[PDB]
Write a protein that binds this ligand. Structure first.
Ligand SMILES: [Mg+2]
Ligand SMILES: [Mg+2]
Lengths: 270, 269
DNA sequence: TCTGAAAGTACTTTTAGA
DNA sequence: TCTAAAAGTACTTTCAGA
């Protein structure tokens, strides 16, 4: 929490003097002042105990700890190259809000189970379109390095052909940020009718979306207008890296040897 | 710099007594002890002045600021939901850690100029390989919907062909997370010899090879071991979204008309 | 209850010795 | 130079008074 908001939240519970002491600290210039208790007491014409009491009601041990957070945020605000604009802050907000929204939707028992489904499957398949298609290509690169036999598909023709060759040892991961993409939903259903296990990634909850073996609910974008939203890959990439971390710990010793052999052949071929 | 390196960077010039104090605070478990001066004084058999002298040696006013800097970082370290597993915790930090670093690496006036560079450019190209290739394709999708004439390329055979058809009104953006990819660096130079403006995205700083119009510094992965690092697209994804935001407000109404036209005609009519 | 004033204290400064 | 101990202080705690 920004200290400007921390004083704001701890406002209506403060005494009249401290409510005025806050008003000085909410001022923008205040950071450039001498902020020692001796100076602040003379400038605001108060006692040093008043500063301690004001900091205590803000949730601090005393004025020394309060002024440290106040100065620490400013030094962290001044450690940047440029001072950021509302546009710069809005884009960073969408990343952090998605991180916190994803964090609220984390289903640990589901994620390991899906990671287990990848391990047990002989062949793993990735269906996506647009940005979701690029997400599918990312997981294909990441997991093939660990020894998973996998392929990625990105068009309707690719989905239909791959489904026709699936069996009970196949697994398909479907990506649909909107949750209503026609090619993703049908082909995943077509995969199920061939015995393949199916997992769907979406940001919308759907009652009939219980058809697939697993259904991972991902975060929704912070911006309301579509044109202003951040990268559409991010809602799934959070869960991509989670399932990857869980999947890596299953037979970690053997999987690392597969990774290092993959990395050796690539790096040494200069 | 975290509290770990400031003690690491501030070590060799410390006296023998304080160097023991350094390792005491550098050990992971010491966070849980009573970090008051007296308790630490009793544990280490030192003087309370020694703690103040040690803390000033780290660049602080005294022991009070050191502990608060020490304990606040742990408060920053464990303000997440304390229910998840260590696996879930590590991934969520690496996502945040990249965002913490990215915000500090932002050069707003540089990103604005790049956003202007794409608008003024008649043709824009995105070069990348592997994960960097996927980022290039992602950026191609976002800007094409706004009316930018662009193509994305992911192999060196594509890079060489494109460089032949480029001129002074072309602009190419190369993505190389390592900063030492031969195809990205060489083809970027071939673009400049054709008169086009060049922008390079890299996590390693390089003003030595300031041959490109702009060089954008992206965040580095929090995990030290390669196998455990999160998606490699994240350092690029932060800056492409920022550049997209600045570009969007340039002739916003006309950009929005094209964007709605894109979804109208390229979505089952 | 609430404020400043006085007494108290976790550290901070000064000091003397090795 | 370096340290602990002594001396000092920037707040912190205690507490009369309105
Ligand atoms: Mg003495
Ligand atoms: Mg004085």
């Amino acid at each position: 929490p920004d200290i400007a908001t921390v004083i704001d939240s701890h406002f209506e519970e403060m005494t009249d003097l401290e409510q005025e002491i806050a008003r000085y600290f909410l001022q923008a210039e205040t950071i450039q002042d001498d902020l020692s208790s001796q100076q602040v007491t003379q400038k605001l014409h108060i006692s040093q105990a008043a500063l301690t009491r004001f900091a205590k009601k803000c949730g601090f041990t005393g004025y020394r700890e309060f002024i440290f957070q106040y100065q620490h945020e400013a030094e962290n605000q001044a450690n940047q190259v440029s001072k950021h604009s509302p546009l710069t802050k809005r884009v960073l907000r969408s990343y952090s809000n998605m991180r916190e929204q994803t964090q609220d939707l984390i289903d640990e028992v589901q994620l390991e189970r899906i990671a287990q489904l990848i391990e047990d499957a002989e062949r793993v398949y990735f269906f996506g379109t647009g940005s979701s298609g690029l997400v599918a290509r990312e997981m294909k690169l990441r997991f093939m390095r660990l020894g998973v036999v996998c392929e990625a598909l990105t068009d309707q023709d690719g989905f239909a052909w791959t489904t026709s060759i699936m069996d009970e040892n196949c697994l398909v991961l479907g990506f649909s940020l909107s949750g209503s993409t026609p090619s993703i939903l049908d082909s995943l259903l077509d995969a199920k009718e061939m015995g393949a296990k199916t997992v769907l990634f979406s940001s919308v909850p759907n009652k009939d979306s219980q058809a697939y073996t697993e259904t991972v609910l991902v975060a929704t974008h912070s911006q309301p207008s579509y044109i202003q939203r951040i990268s559409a890959q991010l809602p799934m990439l959070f869960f991509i890296d989670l399932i990857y971390a869980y999947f890596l710990e299953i037979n970690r010793e053997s999987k690392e040897k597969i990774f290092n052999s993959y990395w050796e052949n690539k790096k040494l071929n200069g």
